[PDB]
Design an enzyme around this catalytic site. Structure first.
Site, short mmCIF file in Angstrom:
data_model
loop_
_atom_site.label_atom_id
_atom_site.label_comp_id
_atom_site.label_asym_id
_atom_site.label_seq_id
_atom_site.Cartn_x
_atom_site.Cartn_y
_atom_site.Cartn_z
N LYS A 49 0.84 -1.19 0.00
CA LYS A 49 0.00 0.00 0.00
C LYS A 49 0.88 1.25 0.00
N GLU B 158 17.50 3.14 0.13
CA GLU B 158 18.30 1.96 -0.21
C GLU B 158 17.37 0.78 -0.52
#
Lengths: 139, 138
Positions: A40, A76
């Site tokens: 989501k 990252e």
């Protein structure tokens, strides 16, 4: 419990791509579940991946533009697609509906990863690849 | 046999996301390119748009995304349109943008083993150099 594979994805690729792939993988005797790992807009990708890796031998992410745009907070993301916990490993990211330019913007490092591309590879081919790895075939 | 060098057919969803920056780059490489009037909305006629663009443009290309092929429900024979020739103009280098191999296999199977560009493997500048090499005889 002893699931073989989980597929992280964006909401937009669930029925379009992930579901047929999961069914195709089930046809090759591969336990795969994906319904609980849809990403989501406000969900944390890292939390989802580590949860799936606890209960699954292998993992993969469906990399689409929607996917990288959804979780804006991820700097990252390149490390996440090879995350390993216990004797479980994240393998073969699937570049689905993404641009090389998009990948360059969010995570340049992702470009030099072993991956699959749905533009060049079909669902059957991609499923055979994942099944080759999970079923320790030709080895 | 025309004034414009290239026109780009596309879907509404790839207009600002992809066609705009690509056309901007193509203009930076000295290629007269217009795309604004060739957006393919739902219910539009692809053949009409392509023939219109070929009337005033030397070359043409289509941005093949899943959206694009979804637009023309009446399009059975889409394989021919991407190499259509009108007057002395030709449709060249389809651009696979945000599409699946399966999607292409379903709508126009003949396109799968045809020379094209891929926005997943190639950057916008990379794609523009190929396009400009062909269009400008470099």
């Amino acid at each position: 419990s002893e699931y073989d594979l989980f597929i992280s994805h964006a909401s937009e690729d669930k029925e379009d791509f992930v579901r047929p792939l999961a069914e195709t993988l089930q046809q090759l005797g591969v336990n795969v579940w994906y319904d609980e790992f849809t990403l989501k807009v406000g969900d944390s990708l890292r939390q989802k991946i580590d949860s799936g890796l606890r209960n699954s031998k292998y993992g993969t992410v469906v990399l689409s533009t929607d996917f990288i745009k959804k979780d804006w907070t991820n700097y990252e993301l390149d490390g996440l697609v090879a995350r390993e916990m216990n004797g479980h490993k994240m393998i073969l990211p699937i570049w689905h509906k993404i641009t090389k330019n998009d990948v360059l913007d969010y995570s340049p490092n992702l470009a030099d990863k072993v991956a699959l591309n749905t533009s060049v590879n079909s669902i059957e081919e991609i499923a055979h690849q994942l099944a080759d790895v999970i079923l320790n075939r030709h080895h």
